[PDB]
Design a binder for this molecule. Structure first.
Ligand SMILES: CCc1cc(C(=O)[C@H]2C=CN([C@@H]3O[C@H](COP(=O)(O)OP(=O)(O)OC[C@H]4O[C@@H](n5cnc6c(N)ncnc65)[C@H](O)[C@@H]4O)[C@@H](O)[C@H]3O)C=C2C(N)=O)ccn1
Ligand SMILES: CCc1cc(C(=O)[C@H]2C=CN([C@@H]3O[C@H](COP(=O)(O)OP(=O)(O)OC[C@H]4O[C@@H](n5cnc6c(N)ncnc65)[C@H](O)[C@@H]4O)[C@@H](O)[C@H]3O)C=C2C(N)=O)ccn1
Ligand SMILES: CCc1cc(C(=O)[C@H]2C=CN([C@@H]3O[C@H](COP(=O)(O)OP(=O)(O)OC[C@H]4O[C@@H](n5cnc6c(N)ncnc65)[C@H](O)[C@@H]4O)[C@@H](O)[C@H]3O)C=C2C(N)=O)ccn1
Ligand SMILES: CCc1cc(C(=O)[C@H]2C=CN([C@@H]3O[C@H](COP(=O)(O)OP(=O)(O)OC[C@H]4O[C@@H](n5cnc6c(N)ncnc65)[C@H](O)[C@@H]4O)[C@@H](O)[C@H]3O)C=C2C(N)=O)ccn1
Lengths: 268, 268, 268, 268
């Protein structure tokens, strides 16, 4: 009986209990939505992590680089929610860039094969998922993806940043197609969140310099954000995604909503 | 028991039953909010128009250019909602520019006294209202103002456009102050809506050329908007404002949410 | 025989030998341009300061808030460059905001009369000058104004920032009119330069907090700028203005060129 | 004795006498620069086309997707300009996207292998070229690439647009590295130019719908541009690139200069 009461939503991107996607799924269910999850390759793990969600939800395997996974995607989803039913929302919360495209490894030293894999998973997959799922979405539906403001360069993030720039551009095009189905397509630019991977990197997983740079980046965030920013709490981001999945933002598409504490609206 | 259940919200800007503000108030009340309205100078009229709202709400006079109105504002609002209570939201939906700053009258022919009056009411008042109301707002509160994308020049709108550019900049600063009170400050950029004034202008109220230019502007909107745009329906805009007044966009401030059908994300 | 060889250019904004305008005039003359200067109210001083320029140039009084000054402006300029001749360029390098609109004085405490005076001189005057001068400009001409990136809020600058937001918007409209005369209109966003006033402020002229905030702002600039930034050297900015006055940027108008060392293209 | 007198500049991208690059090379030489050209795979043709340039210039083969070409690039360039000498400028004017990523072929039907090839040549190569050439560039040097505003979606261009979004982001990062060598990195966003390929497409080479869409896009350009736009004349674009290669835009890097007639600063 909440924001998403009666909505059927597919949520990808869960890998650990610290994933933004995990918190997206929790808030969504708390708000009355029925979910259908998708996981990359460690499904046994994802399954075990997802049992902790408020309610149960079927888990479907989905390797965004696998054409067969995508081709059969809509089929398996309908099977999970039952024939005759369609999705009202889709959450894209996946991203990746080989170590070579981030951290201390110099920007120029990233081989195209690695950058291409990063863009395939981080940006193109947004279009892939929409393509596979639009056929089984209801008018008024909503697709949303996770993003971070790449309008300016920054240290460490390197090619992952370039992948976001590409993603934002793909979103604007996905909106054109999604509009034919009465569906909206938007992105959510979050502030930095301490997921497992992020912590590992801050801890020096990808080099000391990278870790040091990303650390004072997080610190400058809470300082710039007029309402502050708590990197250990992904709830404010999960709510924003749910706001976009609801019926309360019916006139916005091909857009980006910033859930970063307002940090990007301030020089300092 | 809706989006704004239990929220006390002040809504300015109602002048006719076609005002964006009127539709903001309606949706807000339908969602369980208690309102406190403010009107410019024709209160008898505003009063008569507002009786048509779902529920009743006290109407307070407020001339945004009157220092006394603003000085006593918070006092009269507390009186209306009762001592001990505070506002959880504030909607700024006022705007104005003398005929000389819009339409066929050439851009260069607008005397500064007129432009200054337009900016005083359309942009500075956003800061004025926040100043007067922040002292009586609850943490988690939300201030929202009506806006239109002025990132690019356009015919007819002339100085009103310049006033919006100023407004967007004031919003970013209001967010800095509002943040000290745990309050967010955002703007909503709407697509063109056929209010009384807009219709009059399209009908040639400010010259034939102006009317003709604004008319094909509205037409290009629905064409560019991936989800289309209905200029006669302000409901999609009212909902977006309510989304910002709710607790579902807790990490965004000093920002702009586009409720324009996605028209600004497309070249054509 | 340089960049502006044979060009007649009017340059406003000189007040001391540290003014951006002073350096604009110097580089322009070094590049073969004939100038016509305008000064605010201390002409004896301006005159004495300008004698130091490479070559001599007539000085005309111009109070941007004085309608008579503007009305007779074109007349006096033609007299100075001789009947039959027209200007090929115009440099707007003036700006002002009462103490109340900047520094430690809280944002909300700036009375509209002060903000309005600041916007009149800092933004509207851009339109005023174009209006008066376009009638006496040659096709291929170029108008340029001084600006600073106000796309994000920042401490201390307060309303002066809002005035720039307005200026950028006015520039886009001035371009529409200037285009009818075959003339371009652009702005140059400079990094912080240590003019007399800026130094005074950094020294605490408008409060200690303001001075401290602006000081670490300048420091963060050179750090973010991929090519660095030297606040004591206005030459890089003067050259950029001359680039816009030349014939080498013939397809850009209603635009903004950033001469800030590239600081705005980087988060850090 | 012109803008680039004494400058050694490498210019890639020439394929026909209608290529933007061809006009870049012409204006550059007319302004006193010594060039070193690079061509893709039809060197016999490029050679024959380039004989028509004002002066002669060595042509080096360069397949941006060939690691060997890039690895030996700097070596062959030094050989061409003679040991002891370095480049003062580099022009990246290459772009490509398989038919499947543009035109009538639906956005969702573009296989990643094709999109990846387009991004490799259109965006990543900007970084590749900088990497290979920075070691042999002089302080004060300048790298510039051709671009088109992809901030908004548009019909027909599809993935090529996404590739530009990526390119703009890569440019901001290239600037960080180039800055270490005292070198600037900028992009030039041009209005539509009737190159051979563009004409072919307008003529229906990639489908009738695509051709029709791109045709009214070009038409809307001249209408929006305050100074107009001539799609058959690439000279205004060539000059802008030369402006960036000169010493008159010393404080701008990681940026984008719009040589589009000012079309992007206007809604209509
Ligand atoms: C200064 C620069 C900056 C950076 C940020 C951020 O990085 C911030 C913004 C977006 N995001 C995005 O949020 C999404 C989820 O990431 P999380 O942080 O939750 O991390 P997780 O690693 O927990 O989860 C995401 C998913 O990646 C998935 N994976 C990889 N390849 C595939 C594939 N091929 N198919 C299917 N799944 C795959 C994986 O299985 C996993 O479930 C991504 O799109 C992110 O980029 C995360 C942020 C953070 N801080 O952790 C914010 C502000 N400024
Ligand atoms: C191509 C350019 C463009 C324009 C738009 C728009 O103009 C669109 C966007 C914002 N708005 C904003 O919405 C707000 C409300 O305007 P409405 O359209 O409802 O019109 P209304 O005239 O109905 O209502 C607004 C209020 O102005 C108030 N008024 C004037 N002076 C004062 C004062 N001094 N003190 C108190 N009240 C005063 C007046 O009393 C009235 O209630 C304003 O801030 C508008 O600019 C309206 C739009 C429209 N189409 O009608 C959208 C996209 N592109
Ligand atoms: C973090 C915020 C920020 C700020 C900046 C800047 O402030 C920077 C950018 C633009 N500018 C602009 O450059 C122009 C010239 O300012 P200067 O710095 O040279 O200062 P000056 O005070 O030397 O000169 C400008 C003129 O103001 C003129 N004046 C006032 N009123 C009038 C009037 N009514 N009629 C005629 N003249 C009048 C006055 O006579 C004087 O000649 C203005 O438009 C400025 O805002 C200056 C900067 C600086 N650092 O000094 C850059 C980056 N980030
Ligand atoms: C509404 C959308 C839109 C589009 C535009 C434009 O497309 C406009 C903007 C940039 N450009 C860019 O200008 C550059 C040059 O393109 P031209 O138009 O001259 O076309 P050309 O085809 O003449 O030349 C470019 C080069 O591509 C080169 N090529 C392909 N692969 C490789 C490779 N692997 N290695 C080396 N060379 C290769 C090829 O050899 C050729 O010399 C590119 O980066 C373009 O995208 C061209 C425009 C136009 N109208 O022709 C402008 C505004 N709005």
């Amino acid at each position: 009986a909440g924001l998403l009461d009666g909505k059927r939503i597919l949520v990808s991107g869960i890998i650990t209990d610290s994933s933004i996607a995990f918190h997206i799924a929790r808030v969504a269910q708390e708000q009355g939505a029925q979910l259908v999850l998708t996981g990359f390759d460690r499904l046994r793990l994802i399954q075990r992590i997802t049992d902790r969600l408020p309610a149960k939800a079927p888990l479907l395997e989905l390797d965004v680089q696998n054409e067969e996974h995508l081709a059969s995607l809509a089929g398996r989803v309908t099977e999970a929610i039952g024939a005759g039913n369609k999705l009202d929302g889709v959450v894209h919360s996946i991203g990746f860039m080989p170590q070579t495209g981030m951290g201390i490894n110099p920007f120029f030293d990233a081989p195209y094969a690695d950058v291409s894999k990063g863009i395939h998973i981080s940006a193109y997959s947004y279009a892939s998922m929409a393509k596979a799922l639009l056929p089984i979405m209801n008018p008024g539906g909503s697709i949303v993806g996770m993003d971070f403001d790449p309008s300016r360069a920054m240290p460490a993030y390197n090619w992952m940043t370039v992948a976001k720039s590409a993603l934002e551009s793909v979103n604007r095009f996905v909106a054109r197609e999604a509009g034919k189905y009465g569906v909206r397509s938007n992105l959510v630019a979050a502030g930095p969140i301490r997921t497992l991977a992020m912590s590992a990197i801050v801890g020096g997983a990808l080099g000391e310099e990278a870790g040091a740079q990303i650390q004072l980046l997080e610190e400058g965030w809470d300082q710039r954000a007029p309402i502050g920013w708590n990197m250990k709490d992904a709830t404010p981001v999960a709510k924003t995604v749910c706001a976009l999945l609801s019926d309360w933002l019916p006139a916005t598409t091909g857009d980006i909503i910033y859930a970063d504490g307002g940090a990007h609206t301030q020089l300092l």
